[PDB]
Amino acid sequence: NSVRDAYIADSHNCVYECARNEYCNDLCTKNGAKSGYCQWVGKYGNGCWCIELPDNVPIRVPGKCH
């Protein structure tokens, strides 16, 4: 598939921390996702989670934020 649900990440494999769900919905949708929300707890801790984020945008993968 060309989309996936995951933490959106930058070019350094770092999540985007969040204080508001709105921040994440905006961030996710402007990058092509259908919606998003803030995770205050999750696999990698605090960060925005996007629904159906296209695969030309990075997601947090195993390893470190560098």
Tab-separated table of C-alpha atoms in Angstrom:
chain	number	residue	atom	x	y	z
A	1	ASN	CA	0.000	0.000	0.000
A	2	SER	CA	1.045	3.609	-0.602
A	3	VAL	CA	-0.272	4.806	2.794
A	4	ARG	CA	0.137	3.783	6.429
A	5	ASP	CA	-0.871	4.751	9.957
A	6	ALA	CA	2.148	5.709	12.058
A	7	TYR	CA	4.026	8.478	13.794
A	8	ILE	CA	5.015	11.054	11.170
A	9	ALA	CA	8.754	11.787	11.346
A	10	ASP	CA	11.241	14.257	9.929
A	11	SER	CA	14.404	13.472	7.909
A	12	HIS	CA	16.249	12.575	11.128
A	13	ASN	CA	13.854	9.764	12.165
A	14	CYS	CA	12.462	11.977	14.932
A	15	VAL	CA	8.799	12.220	15.875
A	16	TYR	CA	6.937	15.503	16.126
A	17	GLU	CA	6.075	16.065	19.788
A	18	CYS	CA	2.667	17.525	20.510
A	19	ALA	CA	0.603	19.373	23.082
A	20	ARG	CA	-2.668	19.454	21.084
A	21	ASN	CA	-4.597	17.009	18.942
A	22	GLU	CA	-5.327	19.880	16.529
A	23	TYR	CA	-1.607	20.436	15.893
A	24	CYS	CA	-1.315	16.815	14.765
A	25	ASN	CA	-4.432	16.800	12.615
A	26	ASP	CA	-3.105	19.877	10.808
A	27	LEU	CA	0.414	18.493	10.448
A	28	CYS	CA	-0.820	15.138	9.211
A	29	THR	CA	-3.411	16.383	6.747
A	30	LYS	CA	-1.205	19.039	5.186
A	31	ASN	CA	1.216	16.180	4.448
A	32	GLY	CA	-1.449	14.124	2.701
A	33	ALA	CA	-2.885	12.055	5.532
A	34	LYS	CA	-6.606	11.754	6.232
A	35	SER	CA	-6.403	12.838	9.887
A	36	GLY	CA	-4.153	12.787	12.916
A	37	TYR	CA	-3.998	13.125	16.676
A	38	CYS	CA	-1.571	13.574	19.532
A	39	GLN	CA	-0.317	10.509	21.317
A	40	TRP	CA	0.725	11.332	24.896
A	41	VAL	CA	1.609	7.649	25.276
A	42	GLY	CA	2.625	5.213	22.547
A	43	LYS	CA	5.312	2.969	21.065
A	44	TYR	CA	7.798	5.845	20.879
A	45	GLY	CA	6.300	8.128	23.531
A	46	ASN	CA	4.729	11.493	22.822
A	47	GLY	CA	4.171	12.341	19.184
A	48	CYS	CA	1.741	12.915	16.356
A	49	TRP	CA	0.060	9.858	14.861
A	50	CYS	CA	-1.278	10.120	11.308
A	51	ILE	CA	-3.953	8.056	9.602
A	52	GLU	CA	-3.185	7.023	6.006
A	53	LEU	CA	0.000	9.041	5.595
A	54	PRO	CA	1.372	8.685	2.028
A	55	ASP	CA	4.711	6.916	1.625
A	56	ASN	CA	6.602	9.882	0.236
A	57	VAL	CA	6.493	11.325	3.819
A	58	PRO	CA	8.670	9.770	6.556
A	59	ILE	CA	7.446	7.811	9.532
A	60	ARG	CA	9.250	6.884	12.727
A	61	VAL	CA	11.016	3.578	12.213
A	62	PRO	CA	13.079	1.436	14.617
A	63	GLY	CA	16.373	3.039	15.568
A	64	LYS	CA	17.178	6.426	17.027
A	65	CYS	CA	16.233	10.018	16.423
A	66	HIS	CA	19.421	11.394	14.840
